């Protein structure tokens, strides 16, 4: 079913909050036993949110492999992705060790640092070129290179150095800056633009490592990002593009992380964004 005649359909009868529910209802369940050990506590933003074993993924050092982040392989679209939480104070070093250790080109961020007055993720990247950080427990020196300031996004430019090899690599920083403290976009125009600003740029493609891609919890803003970002992809791919089912999708990507789009609005902002972006990826 043309998911715009299936849009048009649940806003005339108003059942966002039904279809949403059937989706949690549906949604896969596996074991996070690795989140839950007692060494982990301070690893966790949320006591509700954690990956699941069979996909999280691993630092690599022998001391505690542990963090909030998992890999969401998507087998048809040839994409994969990694989404994590927003760094904590005592995470902060561990992000960049991932980020180094799977070859990432691109780290997408979602969030504001400070939301509804309350803090949503620690400050980890450099404000100044000249006062550059040094993450000590995983031997990491991050400098702030260049800053492209615009309307709804920022795009940075920065430099990780390995301090153990003295190799280093060129990060790009993609901030969507304005995601309403409550609720979500009127209108997918400005998501979409940002959307396609990430993929210009190499950080999707398969000649790097996976994006790292965040929110506050990893889940919610996070999730929306992926979800669009496959199904449009799919569209490009299928002899039959009205043969995307988005609910379907959503339900695979669920199998690699819980929870991933967190609200009905949410659910219904998805759809409309995907909806307007196949008016270019039909060839728009």
Same mark, same amino acid.
């Given at each position: 079913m043309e998911m715009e005649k299936e849009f048009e359909q649940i806003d005339k009868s108003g059942s966002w909050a039904a279809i949403?529910? !059937?989706?949690?209802?549906?949604?896969?369940?596996?074991?996070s036993r690795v989140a839950k050990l007692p060494k982990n506590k301070n690893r966790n933003r949320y006591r509700d949110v954690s990956p699941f074993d069979h996909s999280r993924i691993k630092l690599h050092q022998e001391d505690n492999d542990y963090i909030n982040a998992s890999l969401i392989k998507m087998e048809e679209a040839q994409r994969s992705y990694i989404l994590t939480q927003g760094p904590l104070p005592n995470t902060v070093g561990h992000?960049?060790?991932? #980020?180094?250790?799977?070859?990432?080109?691109?780290?997408?961020?979602?969030? @504001?640092?400070?939301?509804?007055?309350?803090?949503?993720?620690?400050?980890?990247?450099?404000? %100044?070129?000249?006062?550059?950080?040094?993450?000590?427990?995983?031997?990491?020196?991050?400098?702030?290179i260049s800053e492209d300031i615009k309307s709804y996004y920022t795009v940075r430019?920065?430099?990780?150095?390995?301090?153990?090899?003295?190799?280093?690599?060129?990060?790009?920083?993609?901030?969507?800056?304005?995601?309403? !403290?409550?609720? #979500?976009?009127?209108?997918?125009?400005?998501?979409?633009?940002?959307?396609?600003?990430? @993929?210009?740029?190499?950080?999707?493609?398969?000649?790097?490592?996976? #994006?790292?891609?965040?929110?506050?919890?990893?889940?919610?803003?996070?999730?929306?990002?992926?979800?669009?970002?496959?199904?449009?992809?799919?569209?490009? %791919? @299928?002899?039959?593009?009205?043969?995307?089912?988005?609910?379907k999708v959503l339900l695979e990507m @669920?199998?690699?992380?819980?929870?991933?789009?967190?609200?009905? !609005?949410?659910?219904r902002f998805s759809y409309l964004a995907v909806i307007e972006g196949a008016k270019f990826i039909m060839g728009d």
């Open positions: 949403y529910q !059937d989706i949690r209802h549906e949604a896969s369940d596996f074991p992000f960049w060790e991932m #980020v180094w250790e799977q070859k990432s080109r691109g780290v997408v961020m979602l969030n @504001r640092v400070m939301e509804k007055g309350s803090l949503k993720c620690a400050q980890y990247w450099p404000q %100044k070129e000249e006062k550059e950080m040094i993450f000590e427990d995983t031997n990491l020196k991050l400098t702030l430019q920065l430099e990780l150095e390995n301090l153990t090899t003295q190799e280093t690599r060129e990060i790009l920083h993609f901030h969507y800056t304005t995601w309403p !403290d409550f609720g #979500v976009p009127e209108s997918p125009a400005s998501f979409l633009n940002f959307l396609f600003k990430v @993929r210009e740029s190499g950080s999707l493609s398969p000649e790097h490592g996976p #994006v790292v891609v965040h929110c506050s919890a990893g889940i919610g803003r996070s999730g929306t990002f992926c979800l669009a970002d496959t199904c449009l992809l799919l569209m490009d %791919k @299928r002899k039959d593009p009205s043969s995307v089912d988005i609910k @669920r199998k690699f992380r819980m929870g991933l789009i967190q609200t009905a !609005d949410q659910l």
